Structures are given as structure tokens and as C-alpha cells.
């Protein structure tokens, strides 16, 4: 079953890709199922609430007093090297926070990496019904 484990922050880098020590290393990890806007960007710019969700991961992760990761049933790591995991701050989940705030879109989905899609589906509708940011 999936278990926490500890983390320490080194560095947000947007709203779903942050830089964090992991066992003694220093690794990115990338934020399951969601999808927040773009701060760089090669083709657009900054999109929409780009800077946004961004300072809000930010914030929740900086002002926490513990961090930790967990893993899905999946793969572990994406093709760029990046961890795959849902992030927890103070044992709130930073992936569900950004969706419920209408700053993420639940991402396309790949099983088996897919055990807190209802949640976070359910989570983005309710954001959808108050039509916050993304939404609005």
C-alpha cells in the first residue's frame, strides 16, 4: 500500500515541478496527475495563473514544517528523470490544494500511476462549480 515517506525542500520551481532532497539526494520531482500553467515556456510565455500556481506551491511547501512523498503503484520516475509522486505538506497534499483552488487540471492519466484520480477528480469539479481562477 502506498506509505510516506520524508523529504526536504531544496527549491519550487513552478507549481508542479520542485526540486527536493530525497534519500540524501537531490532530485525534481514532478507533481502527479495535475497539471498547472506554464511560467517558462519555449513557444507561449507565462500562461495564465502560470505565476499563480506557481507562488502557491511556493508558499505551501516553503511554510510547512514537514515534507513527504509518496509513490504510486507505477513507475517511479518519468523519461526526464524526474520522481513521480504526490506531495504532502504538513499531511496536506500539495497535488489535490492546487486543483481544489482552480490553479490545476487533473492531467491525462496513466495507469497504474492513477490511485488518487477520484479524489482529485472530484476536487476539480467542485473548483469547476465555483468557478475559481482556471475556471472562472
Known amino acids: 500500500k502506498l506509505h510516506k ?12 515541478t520542485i526540486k ?6 537531490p532530485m525534481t520531482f514532478r507533481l502527479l496527475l495535475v497539471d498547472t500553467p506554464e511560467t517558462k515556456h519555449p513557444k507561449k510565455g507565462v500562461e495564465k495563473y502560470g505565476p499563480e500556481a506557481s ?19 507505477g ?39 492513477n490511485t488518487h484520480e477520484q479524489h482529485l477528480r472530484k476536487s476539480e469539479a467542485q473548483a469547476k462549480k465555483e468557478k475559481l481562477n482556471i475556471w472562472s
Not at 507562488?55 to 503503484?73: Q, R, Y
Not at 490544494?97 to 492531467?107: C, I, N, P
Open 20 to 25: 527536493i532532497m530525497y534519500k540524501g539526494q
Open 5 to 16: 515517506e520524508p523529504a526536504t525542500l531544496i527549491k519550487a520551481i513552478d507549481g508542479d
Open 75 to 113: 513507475q517511479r520516475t518519468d523519461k526526464y528523470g524526474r520522481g513521480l509522486a504526490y506531495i504532502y505538506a504538513d499531511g496536506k497534499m500539495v497535488n489535490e490544494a492546487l486543483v481544489r483552488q482552480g490553479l490545476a487540471k487533473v492531467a491525462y492519466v496513466y495507469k497504474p500511476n
Open 55 to 73: 507562488a502557491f506551491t511556493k508558499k505551501m511547501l516553503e511554510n510547512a514544517k514537514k515534507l513527504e512523498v509518496e509513490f504510486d503503484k
